[PDB]
Symmetry: D2
């Protein structure tokens, strides 16, 4: 018919869902495939995100990838060469208001942009600009973890403090607190005041 | 092991993408499957949406389903029985600010809520509350049409007026205008001023 | 990064599952997308397959596409031009032993070959050479209908004769018989002797 | 509508594709999800399969799961309790002729059976009884690796001996040979005689 199938580079993939749904696991396999395709990739993460590492992007499955920690979205530009093909960003919900513009510029320029972040905070509220990234992206993969109460598929992150469901208005940083995060379905998700 | 697999009803599925990506085609097959499963379904659409029908939900593939046209989101409640299992809503981007609350209430109540709508307007801007519906939904299916210029997969709706790309600020209703809508990829999508 | 993404044409997509799982519905949407991509497509079907049409490929959803009815697999070659990009074949389980070779030759030559057929006969046995097509294909989409007894997803075709489950060894053509076919899950599927 | 969604347990999932497509990576994430769902799982592998481990199921991503090595398919039965919910089998293409019967019996009994194996040998031939498992399974996931020559998605395992493509009739065990296996697309896959 016609030997080759020419297409245009440059698009956005969103990976979203609750904590432990596998966003970074999935970000990491996508970026790995990229290295076997002999393409050049870079991975960004927000400074604030230090749960498992300051330097790296780490999945709770135990796998990691080297990353560039960044404090404003527009700082991504300074790390970008023409040589690179793929830009991956983990924990995008923690990025400033620029992130949509940054990502659209990059996709318009020919970069494959892979973006992973929480769809919702612990309260069930749509998170950062993840909603907007979802709307504008060519691909959206919404992952589900397992509800830690009932076993069926989850779609929420449950914040617990001292073992009780967190309040709606509990600050994101509680200094000496014993807090924990687990996935739940919408029926076990509990947000009281 | 264990004869049966009990799960909890009540969740949200979003179907989104550009015009002609197949949102209503997909909404209609989902609702059909429902009838073979001997479940009861109802389909809502906005009053404003009269492209192919006032009464019905119609796909450009030529298939249709009976629907209830509604002018405010909260009017859905008056049409709901306990007997019904599935609530489908086409063209959700045209619904008022209540729609998220309406949908979350319905899913919390045990209804399977299937929601179809544009992710973006003709300008590439995230559309209504579709972004928020995407964030909060258990499932998101983002469909792609074919770019009518270059043939590769699309993610945008191109508005043309008199054959030229529409302006950014062109009103949604142009009285005697000759306008048309076609899918495009991000590279052929053209929004000038 | 790198403006364009060159790939090689020529591969095989299999669509399989029970009767009424949507194989032809899915074959037809794939072929339609092809026409909007301004590519040329041809659709083959076996002579034996006349349930809804002698001439055409028809889905129980009511949609159809023009087809070329063929009695041996190797007859496909006589209908193929260089101009065409896509070859679709419905009801592949009814094709002779050549079909795998025919399909592999076509994919090696640069054609996109889309193949739809039953994975299993009414007895639950792997059907024709669909198993082999599945093994060798780049893409396999296994569709599920709804179990007409219990409502959960199906994976089997139930043959009924006079309302009772057919026997294992009941001929495919029973002359004046009142027979019917419905999808079932593995638990409701009934094959006695 | 109706509080709960009762379904029947017992079905078959096939994961197939070339070497390095991620079959064990995918088998391992499925089995992990199972542990968070507080279900009991067991993983089998063939004795012959000792590439990374005698005891365990290992993915080239570096992740592993404890397994029970087995020499005949019917030996699976001796390891099965009523307490367990999930049976996973890696490298199924290396299992004897019983495997289909073993798997169908297990799914009919209520077990969730997850089966991973090569769709094709290094020659492009459909592998073991993987074709039959594909036909009869409720779910088929056909994974793709990256072609190590050209970068586009692969569907074949290339066997190389001394750096040259292996012959069609080269034995599976070559005693002191320097052999290697890499994924390729159908165009770079090379099987001479
Ligand atoms: C299904 C499930 C998996 N897991 C484990 C096994 C998975 O391989 C692993 C996936 O974890 P992650 O990949 O780290 O989850 P996440 O990536 O969405 O969060 P982040 O972006 O900050 O890293 O988590 C859980 O801890 N709980 C669960 O319910
Ligand atoms: C791929 C493609 C399909 N089609 C046709 C064939 C598809 O079966 C059909 C799908 O159309 P619809 O299903 O009507 O598209 P849409 O549903 O997203 O919009 P709405 O909600 O308002 O109804 O469109 C196009 O017109 N252009 C295209 O590029
Ligand atoms: C889910 C379901 C759908 N349907 C209807 C609605 C679907 O849109 C339609 C799909 O039918 P088809 O597309 O014709 O099913 P099939 O294509 O697999 O068989 P063939 O290749 O010979 O044509 O069937 C049923 O009849 N029973 C069901 O259980
Ligand atoms: C895409 C790609 C990944 N990889 C790496 C990264 C993946 O995370 C990892 C997946 O490897 P595996 O999961 O081990 O591949 P496989 O599981 O299909 O084979 P087996 O059943 O015997 O274990 O392989 C390659 O080595 N080559 C490739 O082309
Ligand atoms: Zn729960
Ligand atoms: Zn285009
Ligand atoms: Zn059933
Ligand atoms: Zn190749």
């Amino acid at each position: 018919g016609s030997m080759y199938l020419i297409n245009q580079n440059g698009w956005i993939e969103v990976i979203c869902g609750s904590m432990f749904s596998g966003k970074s696991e999935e970000l990491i396999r996508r970026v790995r495939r990229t290295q076997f395709a002999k393409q050049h990739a870079i991975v960004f993460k927000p400074c604030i995100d230090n749960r498992y590492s300051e330097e790296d992007v780490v999945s709770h499955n135990g796998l990691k990838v080297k990353a560039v920690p960044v404090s404003a979205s527009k700082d991504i530009f300074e790390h970008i060469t023409e040589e690179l093909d793929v830009i991956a960003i983990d924990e995008v919900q923690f990025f400033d208001g620029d992130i949509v513009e940054v990502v659209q510029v990059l996709a318009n320029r020919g970069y494959r942009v892979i973006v992973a972040g929480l769809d919702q905070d612990f309260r069930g509220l749509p998170f950062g600009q993840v909603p907007q990234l979802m709307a504008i992206a060519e691909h959206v993969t919404k992952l589900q973890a397992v509800c830690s109460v009932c076993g069926s598929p989850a779609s929420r992150t449950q914040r617990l403090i001292d073992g009780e469901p967190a309040a709606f208005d509990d600050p994101i940083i509680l200094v000496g607190a014993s807090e924990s995060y687990e996935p739940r379905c919408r029926h076990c998700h509990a947000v009281p005041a």
